[PDB]
Design a protein around this nucleic acid. Structure first.
Lengths: 271, 46
RNA sequence: AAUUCCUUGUCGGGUAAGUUCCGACCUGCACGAAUGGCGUAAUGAUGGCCAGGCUGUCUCCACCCGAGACUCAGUGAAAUU
RNA sequence: GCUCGCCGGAAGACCAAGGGUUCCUGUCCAACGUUAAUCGGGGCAGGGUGAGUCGACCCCUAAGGCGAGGCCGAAAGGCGUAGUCGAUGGGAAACAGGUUAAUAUUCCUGUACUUGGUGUUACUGCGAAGGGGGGACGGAGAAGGCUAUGUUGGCCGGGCGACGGUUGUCCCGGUUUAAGCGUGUAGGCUGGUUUUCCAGGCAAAUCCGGAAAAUCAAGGCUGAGGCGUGAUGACGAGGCACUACGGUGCUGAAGCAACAAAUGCCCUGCUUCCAGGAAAAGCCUCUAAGCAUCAGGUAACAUCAAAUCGUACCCCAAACCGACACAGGUGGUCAGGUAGAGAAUACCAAGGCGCUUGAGAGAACUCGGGUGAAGGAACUAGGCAAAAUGGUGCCGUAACUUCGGGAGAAGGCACGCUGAUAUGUAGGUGAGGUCCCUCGCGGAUGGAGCUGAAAUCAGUCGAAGAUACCAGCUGGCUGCAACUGUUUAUUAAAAACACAGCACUGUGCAAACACGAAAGUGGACGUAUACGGUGUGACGCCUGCCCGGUGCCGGAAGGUUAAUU
RNA sequence: AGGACCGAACCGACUAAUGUUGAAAAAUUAGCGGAUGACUUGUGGCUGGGGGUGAAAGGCCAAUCAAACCGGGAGAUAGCU
């Protein structure tokens, strides 16, 4: 639910919080945890490669199952949990044989729901089947791009994909960006959508909130000196040149896709 | 007012110690130059 | 006007007397709408202006308590030429 | 040696880092000490640092470093796997008293504890570089139960007053004792035992996980303090004798209770929130390959072993970093009394100091302070500086507003001491006694003793009762930026830089982009509700007209055009 | 509950005076700002010179920064003193 804080002090007037009581108020599953140390945007050379990264709260990595290759063994959801490594939530499931795993939480999943994977699985949210056995025009998420490696598309808070056609060994999909892409008709996909749709309505409300996420302040560039940025300086506020990155690239329309390796699985890129 | 030199034995040996000088080609050339000059103390070991 | 050269523009308010300040007028030398326009409670070791209280800031300085300055003994510099 | 003054959340005490004999004793005064010097952190000589339990080494790992083969690179070399190093973190064990001129949890006395090896006896399923459990973890807040510690009374010893009084409700001092062992309380968490079965834990498994039954609810784990023992001991104010007036033998009374109370302990707990909170070993269990009249495992007793290195002294300073015996800088631990909300402030205890030139004089002028007739900003670029306001309770409080604020707005009244209400009240703490019980560190009742606010009435002293230290000046109009924050170390703290919010644009994952001759790494163990770049800068009402120029994004008829032939 | 309020430790540096061959190659005294957080601090580690880092001043990188320090080419060149 979306909750608006009262203005008892500056820095709380514009704070908007998203509260989900269904989440587990306890420790996570220890056996499925790993260490995750921060980098600060620096590579093995010690140089900064991505700016505006640093600090934040300590986090632990949850091992999530993006493959879903346990076929013929029904599982039951135990509880919903909060994951600091991603915007969406996760669910702890229990298989009949006694194994536990983490999966992305679909839209309308609760505790006690039953899920299954395989060719013969039922068409219900949370179930994973190859796109060959999924009807056309349905909504799916966590889509595999190559059979066996695990889902890579539609893993965010409230994203999903739509199957539009099936010609041969390939299936055409409409991604959340509007792109028309086609992949082989052997990749697994999960029915339903990722349920955190309210994630987009949150308002941080103050600078300190952004620092908690590990985001460092951004310096414009027109406020620098000519030796530091092409936008440079000047007596006052001049800016008499075309917008440009550091290192000299346009940033206002210039496309930068130069792959040319696939160039077949794209039809209607966007817009 | 805090000054520039803040002593620390552990950091002194790890930065200018004998073994630190022997771990690189350039470090071993420092010792060669000092041996030729005849320095009584090659490094800051002790 | 943090923007107005002519300029202390003109009128009114406040003062015995106001090139500053506040409110209007528009002849905008050379405002203007995300290198944003116009408003805005709260906040500020931020800029300008006016009152009450308060006083040696001042009319106009007087006395007093301490550390140097001055004399005696010991030690004993410097810029410059 | 007797007085005076200063610090006392230090200017006292104990360490790390760093220094390296500055420590103690004898002797010397040239140089060093901002003066003299018999003195010294100075010269010379001798002496001093005692550990199975403290620390290091050692076992284990974080960031990170190195890195057999390997991949890449003109050479040098770069990255990285298996591994191996790396504390600022995890991992067995000692307390009190006595003693030296200088060391001690290290020596002595008394009383304890831990991990290994060998051997004997009894009983036995033992076994890993593998599996599981455990180790193992955030912020804030709220109490309750305790201790350190303090105060008073009782008790024991001593005292009867340099000047009026002081045999009493009077004065001074002491009233101290550990680890270990036994007991398992306040309180916290979790339902137990038995049998059968199973696509999981890279194979196995009696262990972990999962499913289905039966039978009882009392089982277990964790846990401050208190009590007992340790202790017929040690310590002990004061006496009595050696006596160079530098010190040791001998002996030694009381050694209880009540109240108050932590920022420390129970607490790695409990409650609650979003930003969702290390790793590995020791340790406890389970089996594989293997070995079984052996070897190994558990328990008892005896015996042996626990090496090596550090240990002096300073450590908010004259010994460390600043060229100095330099108003500077430097992390952790201990936390007494009266007043007080307090680790502020004032005066003190334990303890430590008066800061390494002095003696006189009492001019101008400079520095740091106190007071002031009448006027009260007339000073000045400018109320710069100074003066002034200052506490608690009650009454009362405007425009405006995003309804939280503005606000401690402004302003007003009361504050000491004595007596009574009440020989000390409300409240807090709680003994004896009585009854009961799963008789125990139990429960109910009971109220002695101790401790102790606030208010009202009356009286009373001074010019002044929040009397000292301590401790907001207030109000009206207006520009800029929303706000808390950030910045030119050493002339600029701002209207500048960040900021939440908003928009455009790039990017379908071997992503764009960035560091790299390359390998590769970051982005990210993320996937368009995501990530990068650019401009604007909370919020409210809004954001008009122009695509000729330059850039960017599309388009194909034609013209022009490289290497090559 | 809070980048909430008053205020010590702790971290900062707005005003004035003194000092300016200073006690000090940036400090002292009296006031002043933040003080549960975008906070502060100990130990160790990583980023190297046309490069680093930078809530952005051309700031900082060992009292040195519009291109650090040391050695070398080197007795660079100087129609100028």
């Amino acid at each position: 639910a979306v909750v608006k804080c009262k203005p008892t002090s500056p820095g709380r007037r514009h704070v908007v919080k998203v509260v989900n009581p269904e989440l587990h108020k306890g420790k996570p599953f220890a056996p499925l945890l790993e260490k995750n140390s921060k980098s600060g945007g620096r590579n093995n050379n010690g140089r900064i490669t991505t700016r505006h990264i640093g600090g934040g709260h300590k986090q632990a990595y949850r091992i999530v199952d993006f493959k879903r290759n346990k076929d013929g063994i029904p599982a039951v959801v135990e509880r919903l949990e909060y994951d600091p490594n991603r915007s969406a939530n996760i669910a702890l499931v229990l298989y009949k044989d006694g194994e536990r795993r983490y999966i992305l939480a679909p839209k309308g999943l609760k505790a006690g729901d039953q899920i299954q994977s395989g060719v013969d699985a039922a068409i219900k949210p949370g179930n994973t089947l190859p796109m060959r056995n999924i009807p056309v025009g349905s909504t799916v998420h966590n889509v595999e791009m190559k059979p066996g490696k695990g889902g890579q598309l539609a893993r965010s808070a409230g994203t999903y994909v739509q199957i539009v056609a099936r010609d041969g060994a390939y299936v055409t999909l409409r991604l959340r960006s509007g792109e028309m892409r086609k992949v082989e008709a052997d990749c697994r996909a999960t029915l339903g959508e990722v349920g955190n749709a309210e994630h987009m309505l949150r308002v941080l409300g103050k600078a300190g909130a952004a620092r908690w996420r590990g985001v460092r302040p951004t310096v414009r560039g027109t406020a620098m000196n000519p030796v530091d940025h092409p936008h440079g300086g000047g007596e006052g506020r001049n800016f008499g040149k075309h917008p440009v990155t550091p290192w000299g690239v346009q940033t206002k329309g210039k496309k930068t896709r130069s792959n040319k390796r696939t160039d077949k699985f794209i039809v209607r890129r966007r817009s | 007012m805090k000054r520039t030199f803040q002593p620390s034995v552990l950091k002194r040996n790890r930065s200018h110690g004998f073994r630190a000088r022997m771990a690189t080609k350039n470090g071993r050339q420092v010792l060669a130059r000092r041996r030729a000059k005849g320095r009584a103390r090659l490094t800051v070991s002790k």
